[PDB]
Design a protein around this ligand. Structure first.
Ligand SMILES: *[C@@](C)(CO)[C@](*)(O)[C@H](CC(C)C)NC(=O)[C@H](Cc1ccccc1)NC(=O)[C@H](CC(C)C)NC(=O)[C@H](CCc1ccccc1)NC(=O)CN1CCOCC1
Ligand SMILES: [Mg+2]
Lengths: 235, 233, 222, 244, 231, 240, 212, 195
């Protein structure tokens, strides 16, 4: 075989590149940032109709001001979330304040390359980390198993990512309202999803300065789905 | 937890217009026994610093070895070891202060009181104290042990505050130091007549004087003193 | 048996105004009945408009200040040069102190600066990390002399409005920087008279939105 | 580094099997057959010694049957050296239980712990598994007489009658044929010997190539006795059932 | 081929392929330039984005008030090495009350990278660094390679198409070295240097990253509208 | 210590050791979980190539983790014991610190977390086991049924099956289970569970185990005759 | 210190003084001895100020982590046991804490737990903790009924601290009141003993031992 | 903590434990239950150092409950007592020992006999017809030596126990605020509410 922390001749870590392929197999997750808030949406993708879809937890709270969506080997995300929550609460204990979204993301990304021959392999999951702080306002971050993170105005990850990203390139502008962003996530999710989009196989969430991080009910999302279909038929 | 065995008494020092002076006697006491007489308690580091040490002598010799090793380590991969990147008095002090406080924090102190005297690269006079507790302080005059009680009062009559430093020459300053050493010989029961003195000047550099003796002593009045009160013969 | 602690004397004093805050401290350093230094500062600018003093055992005091100054430095490195607020500094200092709960730093710590609304702030700590924001605090050897005077003159305690039959209290109001410095100087001259470990010099650090200014005054040297 | 020479003993095949466990079982299938039969009034343990030499000291020998405590014994199939490592552990474990609770260890608890040790060698540590299969015969006041088996995988199961080692397929068919629930010890003795006699790879079954043991309540009133048969006692029981 | 499985193996010609593959990760990285005069030292860095919706990856990191670096290659490895430098600079300050010499900073990075090239299990660092600083012997510029090799220079560049800027600085050597007591002109020279490594793309306001340190200037970084002056 | 990374990514982005652990689960005897309106039923296959077994003492397929939660599995039997033991210890630890028994979701999340840890720890292979965890939360009458697998992912199911020929019985349950109206009684739930196993098993003799869990720590295992009555009843209705 | 909390018809009353001492030196008159853990949980502080302050804020962090992990507010029992198990680990090391964890949840209702630094943990309806606890007990016990109104219960809690503040030399400053209902805790003001004592004396006719 | 008593009669074991929890000059609580159910037919009362008592009791409880789940079987009172003794015997030579004294009352379902075990903090175990810990024994043992018979009923045992509590309430210096009484027999554990 070969070392876990081996470089390829092109100058890339084999295991990191292979974990990126695992993330492409994962279910779609989309995030859009506005001046009124950040929206996070995911494809649930139940493997069978007998599976109770509401138990599929792919959007997750880290703190009141920071939320998180995932894609790939979702079991690997549990210890990443556990670390993120501890990092956020610990910082509040040490400094009597909310922790910056960027600093939280950096702390999570420090776990990424702590593998070798530390854990035995990289994480097989990508994260979208959304939040708000007083300094840099509403933010969206894409955290990879390479240990790298980019800030985004909008970002899609998972199987339908390259198609959804191209759509986000055209649709995003700096004056998007929160409502406009909610519909835009639903619209783009419905396009790339295999099965038909409804309130049971897709989930929305947002983070605002005022109300913090909230996962939407299936009743609330269902109305936004109905509002979306009506608006597309109206021209 | 320690107890000091072979010990050295006072170390005294002061600033003057162009530099600093420091002095200490050559005795190694073993309790009340004045055991060793050839002990050098002033240790030069480079050509710009002198470290004066009182207290336990075994711990003094350990500190000597550390400073000796510090000079060696600083020279490693350092083309400017005898120029811009030479050891400053402030570097040497901060290192010792760090060690002293770390050792007290482990409940195993170096049983010493230390005065680092020197001149910085920009010409500024350096004079700072540190002891077994890790306590540090600076003053125009500094002294340890009995020196703190008897020398400082005499040296402060010459340099009482900062503004008195430019007004104090090396001749006046050395005179005060030598006088203080005489007073300590009169009054400290663990002092010796023989001592060393060091001057670090910003112009003339390091001058190390060995085998000095206390002299011009007043003892003649003793012949007139008879009995302890009523006795006449 | 080796005693790892010592007492270096001295006293410190912090007062907060509307848009400013002062942190004063005498410059005398002592052991037993000897003076070590007539000018050894123990009030320090730590950056981010935070001034700090840790009075008592000077070795522990210097160690703490050194560690906090370093904490400010790493706060910038880890959080994109964000300004460390006075409340966040206070909480951080609690953890520094309580970290040595079973071998304490033998010091009374006071920090001063401006809060996030621009208003003057003073925080005070016990040796093991308990803290509290106050308008007023004296610390150190002469704390017991100065503190009751501050209660009377800063917070107008035991003072009633004349002619109101001791029914209406003297109303609380912010003091000007001029009035506060008068109280600091009088507090230290009084402390110098009656406490042997206090004297030589007074160094005040004033903190406004414009930065950190210094003022020095002579004290009696006996 | 050393990665080059690692066999990776604790991994799955593409079919979801543990290579080393499967190969250890293949090793055990060449070891001398051991049979356990549980009756209503006792248990029989019978085992065939591996091709004996005439100059082997037979009376002062122990290869197949080992005593764990006064109430529990085991029949071994595989590497003897490996079995003795596990037997000493099991003996110690029984004494730890007795020391802790002042009661003799229940059979299953002892079996589970020994099986858990085997399991560990298949999941972590990078070492080869123990090439051993046990038949546990024992008694306690909860379940009475009990037969168990464990193998290198660390999986264990309970039985009325069971065989391990060589020719288990043929042996199990014969036991399944003649076994019934109301059976006595003396009948089970006869079944055990008859089964070995037909499944053996040898020409004829003799006293010098066997190890035999019973666990009866045939002591005096409400107590259990372990009988590890002597050579002459095996010679007599072989004549008494008409095999020689 | 057969000798690139790990860092502990030499090839028949005496090469360490894993170290060479780590060197290859630097060549894929975005260009960054370093240059100095006698009074100041300047870093210029071309930042890279994932797409138009993403931010631009930050290339420059501060190590102390008088020292910092720029990176090219694996960013997490730069974070590890910069953190180590921050600690070493800090150790020098707390223990010796002494600003760490830029030359010692280089020696420490060399020795840390080396240990990862002689032991089983580990891997070489996959990043190159340009360290600038002002200490007791004036301005300095260092080039770090993850093989362990550290080199002091007047000017240099690393990353993709770094040869263009490196040639320019080799021509301009006599000019920019004497830009003393003039920060803006030394930056202009560094901005013109990195421009020789551009293809199809030009220097924009959220693309360019400049850092400076000098005699009466702490290590500071300029981004956004603060670099609009130099376009 | 043995450090080797056994579970690693392949070029296509798969962790083969985790996927081969799923094959071990596919080899294991079938296990099924069906939850009704006021109960959950766990059904388990037992292979009949083993006669001369002693069923008194042989390890049962369904294990009590606490008085209110049960765990069945498919895959390697030895591996399952390790998970069951850890789960039982965590169950008592939760009662000790929180002063309340575990929820079924919490217990599942723990067991799933253990399984995940063995997929990115050095020197260990993944568990060749998938579990069905069923029960009722303290002071709650809503039935709970969860599934875990070697990778570490877990989820809730109205009804689910695992093990060999599980795709056949899952097919059966998918058309025979109504979400709008789950089995209203214990009898209905057991019958649907037995029916589903009869699609795969062979004979309804000593091949099927059934365990019924009801609210407030009410768990009981059915005997041969009790199960045989369901088998006899189903076959007579089938001939139509 | 003097702190109390009692259970009654309309929920829980929590009352504390605000003094801090170092020997006979009155160090502060304005200390916050109630810690707000969440909108439904309170913690009281008596003993070592740093010990209490540090570990009860730490307790709040552990309670926040519970509701993030379990998607549900922590029980009063579980919250009190985190603190009691923590101090039990430090038993003998010299921690000094007398605390009361008060709050409401659906499953428990209004609940009070006494927790101290030698590891004692007790559920109960009435507790007084601190150097002046006995003085508070004297007034509280002799006037306590389950059927007290919210208005009367608030006053009795206030009056009990005042009683202790007066008699106990190491209690005083001001009274901080809290009321805990099914909807959460409600703050009922800071009451300086300087004015409160005379106001109570005049209106109630009590404190006849004092020169009027 | 202070008063814990135990009486084994013909068909049951009766445990009585004081309700008071005192710290300093204050009785903080007068309804404290100083006992834990280890298994359906085994009950343990405890007394000693504050904190240690409950921590130890609940730790034992957790271990016995763990055993019960693992084996689907109830340990005999004798087996439980031996486990408890060993834990205390380990503890006494630890850095900080458990300062807890216990009584274990159980009904052995296999023997159909009640059993009472007295174990002190050193790990000193004895099976007894009647037992006590602390200063209680100095009054109750002599009293029970006189009035106890081995063939008594549960009702006779409760009257015998009332006689002990009355004597303690008369001659003990401290107010222990009465006792909580519990009975262990073939049908399990139940509490007497009016004592
Ligand atoms: C009533 C008011 C009194 O019991 C309450 O119990 C309050 C509780 C509130 C404040 C939370 N308790 C105290 O005020 C408490 C009493 C006490 C003191 C010491 C040990 C245990 C209990 N006081 C404190 O904790 C004070 C609070 C300061 C003054 C703000 N702190 C100290 O006394 C400190 C730290 C004591 C300590 C504990 C453990 C290890 C080391 C130290 N000590 C000093 O500041 C020492 N001294 C003060 C006088 O100036 C010289 C230095
Ligand atoms: Mg004087």
């Amino acid at each position: 075989d070969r070392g876990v922390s081996t470089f390829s001749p092109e100058g890339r870590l084999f295991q990191v590149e292979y974990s990126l392929e695992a993330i492409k197999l994962g279910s779609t997750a989309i995030g859009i940032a506005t001046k009124e808030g950040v929206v996070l949406g995911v494809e649930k993708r139940a493997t069978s109709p007998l599976l109770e879809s509401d138990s599929i937890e792919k959007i997750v709270e880290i703190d009141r001001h920071i939320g998180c969506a995932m894609s790939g080997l979702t079991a690997d995300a549990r210890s990443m979330i556990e670390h993120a929550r501890t990092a956020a609460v610990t910082h509040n204990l040490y400094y009597d304040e909310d922790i910056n979204v960027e600093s939280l993301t950096q702390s999570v990304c420090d776990l990424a390359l702590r593998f070798g021959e530390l854990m035995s392999r990289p994480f097989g999951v990508a994260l979208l980390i959304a939040g708000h702080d007083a300094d840099d306002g509403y933010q969206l971050f894409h955290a990879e198993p390479s240990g790298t993170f980019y800030r985004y105005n909008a970002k899609a990850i998972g199987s339908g990512s390259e198609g959804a990203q191209a759509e986000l390139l055209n649709e995003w502008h700096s004056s998007l309202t929160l409502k406009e962003a909610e519909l835009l996530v639903l619209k783009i999710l419905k396009q790339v999803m295999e099965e038909k989009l409804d309130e049971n196989n897709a989930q929305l969430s947002c983070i605002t300065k005022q109300d913090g991080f909230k996962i939407y009910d299936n009743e609330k999302t269902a109305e936004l789905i109905k509002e979306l279909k009506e608006k597309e038929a109206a021209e | 937890t320690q107890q000091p065995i072979v010990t050295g008494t006072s170390v005294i020092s002061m600033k003057y217009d162009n530099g600093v002076i420091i002095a200490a006697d050559n005795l190694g006491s073993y309790g009340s026994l004045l055991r060793f007489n050839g002990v050098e308690r002033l240790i030069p580091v480079g050509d710009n610093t002198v470290v004066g040490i009182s207290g336990d002598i075994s711990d003094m010799q350990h500190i000597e070895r550390l400073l000796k090793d510090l000079v060696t380590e600083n020279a490693y991969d350092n083309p400017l070891a005898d120029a811009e990147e030479a050891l400053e008095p402030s570097y040497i002090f901060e290192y010792l202060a760090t060690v002293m406080y770390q050792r007290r924090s482990k409940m195993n102190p170096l049983w010493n009181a230390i005065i680092v005297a020197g001149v910085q690269s920009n010409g500024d006079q350096f004079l700072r104290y540190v002891n077994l507790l890790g306590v540090t302080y600076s003053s125009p005059t500094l002294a340890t042990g009995f020196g703190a009680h008897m020398a400082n009062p005499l040296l402060r009559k010459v340099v009482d505050r900062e503004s008195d430093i430019p007004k104090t020459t090396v001749q006046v300053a050395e005179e005060a130091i030598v006088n203080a050493m005489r007073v300590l010989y009169y009054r400290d029961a663990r002092s010796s007549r023989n001592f060393s003195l060091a001057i670090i000047d910003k112009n003339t550099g390091l001058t190390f004087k060995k085998n000095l003796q206390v002299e011009n002593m007043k003892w003649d009045f003793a012949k007139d003193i008879k009995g302890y009160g009523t006795q006449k013969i | 048996q080796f005693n790892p602690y010592g007492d270096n004397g001295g006293t410190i004093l912090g007062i907060a105004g509307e848009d400013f805050a002062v942190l004063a401290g005498d410059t005398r350093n002592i052991t037993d009945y000897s003076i070590n230094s007539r000018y050894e500062p123990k009030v320090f600018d730590c950056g981010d408009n935070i001034v700090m003093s840790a009075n008592g055992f000077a070795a522990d005091g210097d160690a703490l200040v050194k560690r906090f100054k370093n904490s400010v430095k790493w706060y910038h490195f880890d959080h994109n040069d964000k300004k460390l607020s006075i409340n966040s500094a206070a909480r951080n200092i609690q953890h520094l102190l309580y970290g040595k709960r079973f071998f304490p730093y033998y010091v009374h710590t006071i920090i001063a600066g401006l809060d996030e609304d621009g208003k003057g702030a003073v925080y005070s700590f016990d040796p093991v990390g308990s803290y509290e924001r106050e308008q007023c605090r004296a610390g150190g050897a002469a704390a017991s002399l100065i503190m009751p005077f501050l209660d009377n003159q800063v917070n107008f305690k035991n003072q009633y409005e004349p002619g109101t039959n001791g029914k209406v209290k003297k109303p609380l109001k912010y003091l000007s920087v001029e009035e506060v410095i008068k109280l600091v100087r009088d507090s230290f001259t009084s402390a110098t008279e009656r406490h042997i470990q206090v004297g030589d010099g007074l160094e005040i650090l004033i903190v406004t939105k414009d930065g950190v200014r210094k003022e020095f005054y002579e004290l009696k040297r006996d | 580094g050393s990665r080059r020479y690692d066999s990776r003993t604790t991994i799955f095949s593409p079919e979801g099997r543990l290579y080393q466990v499967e190969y250890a079982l293949e090793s055990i299938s060449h070891a001398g057959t051991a049979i356990g039969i549980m009756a209503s009034d006792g248990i029989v343990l019978a085992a065939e010694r591996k091709v004996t030499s005439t100059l082997l000291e037979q009376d002062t020998s122990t290869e197949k049957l080992y005593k764990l405590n006064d109430k529990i014994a085991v029949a071994v199939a595989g590497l003897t050296a490996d079995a003795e490592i596990l037997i000493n552990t099991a003996r110690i474990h029984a004494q730890n239980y007795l020391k802790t609770y002042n009661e003799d260890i229940p059979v299953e608890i002892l079996v589970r712990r020994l099986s858990d040790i085997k399991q560990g060698y298949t999941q972590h540590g990078g070492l080869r598994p123990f090439g051993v299969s046990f038949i546990y015969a024992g008694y306690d006041d909860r379940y009475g007489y009990q037969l168990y088996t464990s193998n290198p995988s660390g999986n264990y199961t309970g039985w009325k009658a069971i065989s391990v080692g060589a020719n288990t397929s043929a042996a199990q068919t014969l036991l399944q044929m003649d076994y019934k629930d109301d059976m006595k010890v003396d009948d089970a003795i006869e079944l055990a010997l008859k089964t070995l006699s037909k499944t053996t790879d040898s020409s004829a079954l003799t006293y010098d190539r066997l190890e035999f043991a019973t666990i009866r309540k045939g002591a005096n009133d409400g107590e259990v006795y372990q009988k590890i048969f002597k050579p002459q006692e095996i010679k007599d029981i072989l004549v008494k059932t008409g095999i020689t | 081929n057969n000798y690139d499985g790990d860092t502990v193996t030499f090839s028949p010609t005496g090469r360490l392929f894993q170290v060479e593959y780590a060197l290859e990760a630097i060549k894929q990285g975005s260009v960054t330039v370093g240059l100095r005069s006698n009074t100041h030292a300047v870093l210029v860095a071309l930042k890279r984005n994932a797409d138009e919706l993403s931010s631009y990856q930050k290339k420059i990191i501060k190590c102390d008030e008088h020292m910092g670096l720029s990176l090219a290659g694996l960013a997490p490895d730069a974070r590890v090495l910069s953190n180590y430098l921050r600690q070493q600079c800090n150790y020098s300050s707390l223990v010796f009350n002494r600003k760490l010499a830029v030359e010692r900073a280089g020696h420490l990075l060399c020795d840390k990278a080396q240990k990862n090239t002689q032991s089983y299990g580990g891997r070489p660092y996959g990043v190159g660094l340009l360290i600038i600083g002002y200490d007791k012997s004036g301005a300095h510029l260092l080039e770090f390679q993850p093989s362990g090799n550290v080199t002091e220079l007047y000017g240099t560049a690393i990353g993709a198409r770094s040869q263009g800027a490196k040639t320019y600085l080799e021509r301009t050597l006599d000019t920019f070295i004497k830009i003393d007591g003039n920060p803006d002109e030394l930056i202009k020279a560094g901005v013109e240097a990195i421009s020789q490594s551009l293809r199809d793309e030009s220097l924009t306001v959220d693309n360019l990253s400049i850092a400076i340190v000098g005699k009466d200037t702490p290590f500071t970084i300029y981004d956004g509208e603060a670099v609009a002056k130099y376009i | 210590g043995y450090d080797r990374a056994l579970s690693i990514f392949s070029p296509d982005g798969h962790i083969f050791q985790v996927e081969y652990a799923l094959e071990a689960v596919k080899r294991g005897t079938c296990a099924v979980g069906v939850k009704g309106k006021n109960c959950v039923v766990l059904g388990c296959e037992r292979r009949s190539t083993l006669k001369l077994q002693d069923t008194r003492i042989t390890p049962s397929k369904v294990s009590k983790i606490d008085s209110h939660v049960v765990l069945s599995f498919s895959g390697l039997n030895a591996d399952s014991r390790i998970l069951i033991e850890k789960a039982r210890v965590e169950a008592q630890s939760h009662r000790l610190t929180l002063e309340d028994p575990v929820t079924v979701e919490y217990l599942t999340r723990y067991v799933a977390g253990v399984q995940q840890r063995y997929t990115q720890s050095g020197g260990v292979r993944p568990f060749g086991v998938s579990t069905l965890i069923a029960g009722f939360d303290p002071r709650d009458d809503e039935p709970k049924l969860y599934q875990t697998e070697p990778s570490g992912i877990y989820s809730s199911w109205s009804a689910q099956t695992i093990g060999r020929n599980s795709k056949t019985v899952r097919e059966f349950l998918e058309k025979n289970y109504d979400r709008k109206e789950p089995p209203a009684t214990v009898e209905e739930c057991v019958k649907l569970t037995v029916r589903s196993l009869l699609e795969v098993v062979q004979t309804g003799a000593k091949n099927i185990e059934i365990t019924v869990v009801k609210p407030d720590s009410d768990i009981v295992a059915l005997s041969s005759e009790e199960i045989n009555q369901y088998v006899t009843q189903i076959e007579q209705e089938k001939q139509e | 210190t003097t702190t109390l909390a009692f259970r009654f018809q309309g929920g829980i009353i929590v009352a504390v003084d605000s003094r801090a001492t170092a020997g006979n030196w009155v160090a502060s008159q304005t200390v916050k001895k109630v810690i707000e853990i969440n909108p439904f949980l309170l913690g009281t502080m008596a003993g070592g100020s740093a010990d209490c302050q540090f570990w009860e804020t730490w307790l709040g962090s552990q309670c926040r982590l519970h509701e993030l992990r379990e998607k549900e507010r922590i029980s009063v029992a579980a919250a009190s046991k985190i603190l009691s198990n923590l101090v039990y680990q430090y038993k003998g090391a010299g921690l000094s804490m007398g605390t009361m964890i008060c709050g409401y949840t659906r499953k428990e209702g209004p609940t009070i737990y006494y927790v101290d630094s030698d590891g004692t943990r007790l559920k109960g309806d009435i507790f007084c903790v601190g150097s002046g606890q006995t003085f508070a007990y004297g007034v509280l016990d002799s006037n306590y009924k389950w059927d007290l109104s919210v208005e009367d219960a608030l006053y009795l809690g206030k009056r009990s601290i005042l009683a202790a503040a007066h008699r106990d030399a190491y209690s005083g400053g001001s009274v901080n009141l809290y009321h805990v209902t099914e909807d959460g805790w409600i703050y009922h003001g800071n009451h300086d003993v300087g004015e409160l004592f005379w106001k109570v004396k005049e209106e109630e006719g009590s404190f006849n031992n004092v020169i009027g | 903590m202070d008063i814990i008593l135990g009486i084994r009669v013909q068909d049951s074991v009766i445990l009585a434990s004081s309700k008071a929890v005192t710290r300093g000059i204050s009785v903080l609580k007068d309804s404290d239950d100083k006992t834990r159910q280890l298994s359906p037919h085994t009950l343990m009362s405890f007394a000693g150092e504050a904190g240690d008592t409950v921590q130890f009791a609940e730790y034992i409880q957790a271990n016995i409950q763990l055993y019960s789940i693992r084996e689907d079987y109830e340990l005999s009172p004798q087996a439980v007592s031996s486990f408890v003794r060993q834990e205390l015997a380990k503890s006494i030579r630890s850095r900080r020992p458990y300062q807890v004294n216990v009584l274990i009352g159980g009904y052995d379902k296999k023997k159909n006999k009640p059993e009472l075990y007295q174990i002190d903090y050193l790990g000193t175990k004895v099976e007894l017809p009647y037992g006590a810990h602390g200063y209680s024994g100095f009054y109750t043992f002599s009293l029970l030596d006189h009035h106890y018979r081995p063939d008594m009923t549960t009702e006779e045992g409760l009257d015998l126990l009332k006689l002990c509590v009355q004597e303690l309430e008369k001659r003990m210096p401290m107010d222990f605020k009465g006792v909580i009484v519990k009975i262990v027999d073939k049908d399990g554990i139940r509490q007497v509410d009016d004592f």
